[PDB]
Amino acid sequence: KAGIPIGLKRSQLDEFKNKYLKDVLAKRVPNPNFLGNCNIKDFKPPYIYS
Amino acid sequence: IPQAHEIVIPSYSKWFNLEKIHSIEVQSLPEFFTNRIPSKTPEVYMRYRNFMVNSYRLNPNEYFSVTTARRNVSGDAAALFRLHKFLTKWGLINYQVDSKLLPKNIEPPLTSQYSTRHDAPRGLFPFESYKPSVQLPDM
Amino acid sequence: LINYQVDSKLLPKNIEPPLTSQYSTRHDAPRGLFPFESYKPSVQLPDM
Amino acid sequence: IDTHTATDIYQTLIALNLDTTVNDCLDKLLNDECTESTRENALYDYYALQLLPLQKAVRGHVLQFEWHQNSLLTNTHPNFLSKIRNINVQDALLTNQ
Amino acid sequence: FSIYGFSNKEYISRLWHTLKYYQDLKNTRMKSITSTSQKIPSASIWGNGYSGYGNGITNTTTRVIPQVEVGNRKHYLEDKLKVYKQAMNETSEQLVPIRLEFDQDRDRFFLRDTLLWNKNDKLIKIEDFVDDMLRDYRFEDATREQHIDTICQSIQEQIQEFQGNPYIELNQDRLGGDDLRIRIKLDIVVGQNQLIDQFEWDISNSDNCPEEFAESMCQELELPGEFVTAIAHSIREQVHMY
Amino acid sequence: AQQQLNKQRQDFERVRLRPEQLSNIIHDESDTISFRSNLLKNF
Amino acid sequence: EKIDSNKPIFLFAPELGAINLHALSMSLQSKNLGEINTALNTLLVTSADSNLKISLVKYPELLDSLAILGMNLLSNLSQNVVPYHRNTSDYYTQHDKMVDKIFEKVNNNATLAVKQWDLLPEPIRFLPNQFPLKIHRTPYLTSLKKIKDEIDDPFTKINTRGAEDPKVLINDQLSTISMILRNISFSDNNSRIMSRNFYLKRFISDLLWLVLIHPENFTCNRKILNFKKDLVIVLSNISHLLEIASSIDCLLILILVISFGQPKLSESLTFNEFQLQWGKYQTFGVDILAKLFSLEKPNLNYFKSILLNNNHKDKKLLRRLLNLYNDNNRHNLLNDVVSFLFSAIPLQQVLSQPSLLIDQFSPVISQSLTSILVIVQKILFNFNKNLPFVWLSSEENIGSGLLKLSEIILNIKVLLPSINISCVQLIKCLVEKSICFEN
Amino acid sequence: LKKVKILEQIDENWSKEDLQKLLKGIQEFGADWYKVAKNVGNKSPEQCILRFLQLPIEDKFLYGDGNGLGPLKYAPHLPFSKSENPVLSTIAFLVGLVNPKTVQSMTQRAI
Amino acid sequence: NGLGPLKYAPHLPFSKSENPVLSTIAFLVGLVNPKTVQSMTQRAI
Amino acid sequence: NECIASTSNALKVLSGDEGYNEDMVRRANFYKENEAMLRENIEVILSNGRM
Secondary structure, X not given: OOOOOOOOOOOOXXXXXXXXXXXXXXXXXXXXXXXXXXXXXXXOOOOOOO | OOOOOOEEEEHHHOOOOOOOOEHHHHHHOHHHOOOOOOOOXXXXXXXXXXXXXXXXXXXOOOOOOXXXXXXXXXXXXXXXXXXXXXXXXXXXXXXXXXXXXXXOOEOOOOOOOOOOOOOOOOOOOOOOOOOOOOOOOOO | OOOOOOOOOOOOOOEXXXXXXXXXEEEEOOHXXXXXXXXOOOOOOOOO | OOHHHHHHHHHXXXXXXXXXXXXXXHHHHHOOOOOHHHHHXXXXXXXXXXXXXXXXXXXXXXXXXXXXXXXXXXXXXXXXXOOOOOOOHHHHHHHHO | OOOOOOOOHXXXXXXXXXXHHHHHHHHHHHHHHHHHHOOOOEOOOOOOOOOOOOXXXXXXXXXXXXXXXXXXXXXXXXXXXXXXXXXXXXXXXXXXXXXXXEOOOOOOOOEEEEEEEEOOOOOOOHHHHHHHHHHHOOOOHHHHHHHHHHHHHHHHHHHHOOOOOHHHHOOOOOOOOOOOEEEEEEEEOOOOOOEEEEEEEEOOOOOOXXXXXXXXXXXXXXXXXXXXXXXXXXXXXXXXHO | OHHHHXXXXXXXXXXXXXXXXXXXXXXXXXXXXXXXXXXXXXX | OHHHHHOOOOOOHHHOEEEEHHHHHHHHHOOOHHHHHHHHHHHHHHHOOOOOOOOOOOOXXXXXXXHHHHHHHHXXXXXXXXXXXXXOOOEOOHHHHHHHHHHXXXXXXXXXXXXXXXXXXXXXXXXXXXXXXXXXXXXXXXXXHHHHHHHOOOOOOOOOOOOOOHXXXXXXXXXXXXXXXXXXXXXXXXXXXXXXXXXXXXXXHHHHHHHHOOHHHOOOHHHHHHHHHXXXXXXXXXXXXXXXXXXXXXXXXXXXXXXXXXXXXXXXXXXXXXXXXXXXXXXHHHHHHHHHOOOOOHHHHHHHHHHHOOHHHHHHHHHHHHHHHHOOOOOHHHHHHHHHHHHOOOHHHHHHOOHHHHHHHHHHHHHHHHHHHHHHHHHOOOOOOOHHHHHHOOOOOHHHXXXXXXXXXXXXXXXXXXXXXXXXXXXXXHHXXXXXXXX | OOOOOHHHOOOOOOOHHHHHHHHHHHHHOOOOHHHHHHHHOOOOHHHHHHHHHHOOOOOOOOOOOOXXXXXXXXXXXXXXXXXXXXXXXXXXXXXXXXXXXXXXXXHHHHO | OOOOHHHHOOOOXXXXXXXXXXXXHHHHHOOOOHHHHHHHOOOOO | OHHHHHHHHHHHHHOXXXXXXXXXXXXXXXXXXXXXXXXXXXXXXXXXXXX
C-alpha cells in the first residue's frame, strides 16, 4: 500500500531509489510529491564557492 | 518502509516534533492535560496524534479524513474532530494534497545562486577588512 | 508469573501503519524571512 | 595621537602573529625528535588555524540572520504613514440618527 | 590607495561604490516587478515565498487571499473562550452509541455507520460534524445539501433518548457491582471477512471498559482497527439496550 | 428586503470611513521630524 | 541619505505577491521571533496601502491573533520579562494504576490533581505591581515639546536598534501592532467586527492603563504619543457600536480624550481655544464622546456615576483613581470635561472674520453641542458649587458666542438648522439650571 | 610563543576524540555538515555547527582577555583628528588608565 | 601591559621624538591657576 | 566615554551603516552567552536548506 515493491531488504534501499528512475521512464510527469521533485530547492550560502 | 515521497510542512510548524509535546498543543487542546477525565491523558494524546501523522505521511497526495481516524481509533468523535482540525490547521497533515508545479523563473542579475562578489558591500556581516600598514616607521 | 519466557517479537501488537519518525522534511517559508546577502567572504587565510 | 594608524597596526600585528604561529606548528610537525603529544597538538592546532576564516564566514552568516530577525519597519522608517481622516458630515448625521 | 582606508577620500570612495551597487540592485528589483506584471514569472531577491502546496503560490501580481482551500474545504475556526470554559469545568464523559442506517428504496441515498458521541459536549455543532462527514464520503454537492438535514435529525434524536448509565446517575458504585451478567453477541463484516463471537459481560460494574477489552481481543487475533471500534461500539450498544 | 438596507449601509459607510490622502491630511511636528538633520546638527 | 534610500531593508507592496491571511495568522500564533516579525512587517505594509483590502469577514481569527499577541507583550513589559530565547525547554484505568502503584510500593520496600489555567493572563491592573500612585496627564503641546527635546539631544538613544536592546524590540512590536489595528479600522465591515470583538477591547483596556498610569516601561516619548493617537483614531472609527465593559475604561477614555486639549494655568473654564492649525486630534475626542453617550445603557450609567461622584478590586481602584485625579475639590472632572467640550467650538476664529469657516467646521460644532447638551440635560444633590453659573459667567462669555453663531447662521450645509436649535436650547437650559442650582 | 591549545575544549558532552574527528572532518569536507556529522558519529549536524562556532581559535591573538581597547574598540568608525583636535584623541587614550573616583574627588576639591 | 592601547600608537624611530601625553598634560594643567592645583593634589610642589 | 561613544555612533548612522560591533563578535564569550539564540537560528537555517 505504501508503494514499496515488496520484501525490500536493508541492502536494496539505494537500488529502490534507482528503481524510482525506471518508474518514470516506463508519458509520466512527476508530482511535487515525488522523491527528488520538490518545488523547494536549497539556496547555497556565500562561503560555498562552486 | 523507506521514504517514498517528499514531506513538506510550513515554516511556522517548525516546533512540531514527534515523541515530544509542545506548549502550543497544551494551550490549544487543554482537555487532554487537565486530570479531570481518566480517558484523556497525554499518553492517549500522543497515541492519536502520532497515528494520524504517520498514517497521513504514507500517501501525501490524498486527503486524510476524520471518518477514517474515527473508524480506526476508539474514542468520542468530538475530541478526534478537534484534534484533526488542530493538526490540519497547523500544517502537519493534508498540507500537500493537491500540489501544483512552479512553472519556471526568469532570473534578472543578482537574483540567482552563486551571485555574490568580493567587491560587494558588506552591509550586515560584521567582519571588516583593514588596510595593511606598510610604511617604514610602521614597519 | 505469566508469559515471562515468551520471546519478544512473539508478543501480540497492534495492527497500525509503520512509523515515519526517521523522515526528512522540507520547510515552506514566506518571502521576507531571510535577508539578501552580498560579499562572498575569503574562506582562506591571507598570504603574508 | 593617530588612531587610524594605531588600528591599522593592531590589525596587521594580529595577522602576523597568526602567520608565525602557523609556521611554528609546521616546524614542530616537520622534525621527528618531538614526542607524540607535541606532534598531535601541532597537527590539530594547524587544522584549527586553517579553519579560522571559515569560522568567520559561518559566524557572519548566522549573525546576519539574527540581525535581520530583530528588524521592524517602525524602527528603521520612523516616518511611516498611516490612514488619518477628517470628521465629516456623515459622522454628525449618524450621531443624530 | 585602499578602499579600506580611514582617511577622508577613501571613506567617501567607499560610500560612492556602495551607493552605485545599491542603485543597480534597485534597478534589478524594478526589472523583477515589471516582468512579473506582464505575467512572465521572474525570480526575486527575496525568494519564491510559498511554493505550490497548502498556502498556495506566492509570486503572482499582488492579492490578498483569505486562505487556500484544503481538500475543497475551509479551515475550522473555533472560540477559545468556550473551549477553556468547557475544559476547565468537566467532570464526566457520558458516551452515546450512534448508529446511522439509510437504504435506497427509502430516502434516496444509502449509508451505514457507527459512532460514539460525548453527550456532555457543547463545543461542536452536529451540523458541522455531519457536513464534514458527508464531505469525507465524497458526496456530490447537491446530495449533501439535500440530506444533511435528515442525517442531523437522525443523530439529534438518539442523543435525547440516551438518559444514561443508571448506576452512575443513581449513586450505587459498589466496587464489584451486582451480578447482572448478559451475553454479548458480535457479527462484524469488515472487508471480505466476518467475525462472529459471543461472551459474557457484567452490567453493574463501572470498571468494565469496552475499549481495553476490544483492543486486547484484536491484538490477540491480529485484526485491524475497524474491528476494534466496531466491537467497542457493539458492547456499549447492547449494554445500553439492557 | 434586508439586502437593500445592507446595500444602503455599504454606500453610506464607504463615504464616511474613507481615508484622506496626499491632501489636507496635514501633519503636525512629531510626524514631519527629520532624524538625519537633527543628528547632523548635534554632531 | 541616498544609500539609506536605496538599501534593501524590506519588501514594498508591489513585490509581496499573493498575501495569505491564514499563514500570517498562524505565523503570529507561533512563538518564533522571526516568524512574528515577518508577519508584522507584511501586515503593516499591506494594511498601510490603498487598493489592498484586508477583509476580516472572510478570515476573522486574524484579529484575535493580533490582540492576543499584544496582550501578552504588555504583560511581559510590565513585569520586566523578556519572552524570546527563554533558555528554558518550551516542551512538556484506575484499577491498573492501583495495581502498578502496589507494585511500586512493594519494589521500594524491597530495595530498602487537576490543573487549572486561563487562556489570557489576569488583565494588567490587578497585578500587585500595577497599583496607581500618579496619573500622567501631560497635555499635547507639552508632549510635543518633550519629543523635540529628546530627539535634539547629543547623547540621544533614539537609534539603539532592535538587536542591541530587547526592550526596544518589545516596544517596536507593540507599536507595529497598534499601527496595524489603526490602519485596518478604516472600513465598514472591519469596524463593525472590531466593535464587538472581546480580545480587542481587553487589549485596549490594558494599553490605556499602561499608557496613563504606568508609562515608565516605554522607551520613548514619541511612542507614547503615537499610542495615544492610534487609540483615539481607532475609538473614533469604532465607538458608534462600542459597549464599554468597566467603569475604569470610561475614566481612562475621558482622561485620554481631554488630554488632547490645552489647559490654562475651580471657578472658571479651565481650557483655552486650542486654535485650528495647532492640531485636529481634538475633533476625534469630541466625536468619541458624542457617540459613546448615545447608549443610555451600560455606557451612560457608567459616565453618570463617574462624573457625579473582582468587583471589589474595581471599586477600590475607582476610589483610588478619583482621589488621585481631584487632588471641595469635587466635580473637577465634570468642569474639565465641559470646559474641554466648550473649547472645541472655534468661536473666536469664526466670529472674528464667515460662511466658509462654519461650512468647514459644522461637524465638530454639531457634535460638541450634542455632547454638552447630553451632559447638561441628562447627567445633572451632592453639589456644593453652582456649576452652570460658573459656566455662564466664565469671563469668556460663551453665551454671547452661541447667540452670535445663531444669528450668523440665520442671516446666511445640512447641519445648520440643527446647530441653531442646539445653540438656543443650550443657552436656555444653562440659565434655567443656574436658577435651580441656586435654589 | 602563544599556542592555540585546541584540544583542551574537552567539555563533558564533547571529548578529545570527538574534537579531533570534528576538526579533521571539517578539513576534509568544507561545509557538508551531514558528512561531517556522520564522520564524528553519535552527534547531530546542529551540535557540530554549534561546537564549531564556539571554538576560541583567535582569542589568544586579540588584545585582551575581555583595561580596554579604548578608541580602537570602535574600529570602523573613528571620528578623531590628530591635527585638528589634538586633545580629544590623547584624552581618549588616557581615560582608560585613571580611576574615576579619584577624578571626582579632585575636581570637587578644585571647585 | 598596563597601558592598553598606547602600545599601538605610532612614533618615529631613533630621532625626533614627539610627546603627545606629556604635552596634553602640560597644556591642560597650564590653564588652572597653580594655587588651586596645589590644593587639588599633593603631587604638585 | 559617553561623548566618544555617541560621536562614533552618530558617524555610523550618518554613513548609512548597521550591524554588530566587530570587536564584540570576534570573541568566544558572545557565543557561549547567546546559546539559545544560536541554537534556534542554526535549526531554522538548516531545516530550510540555507546552511
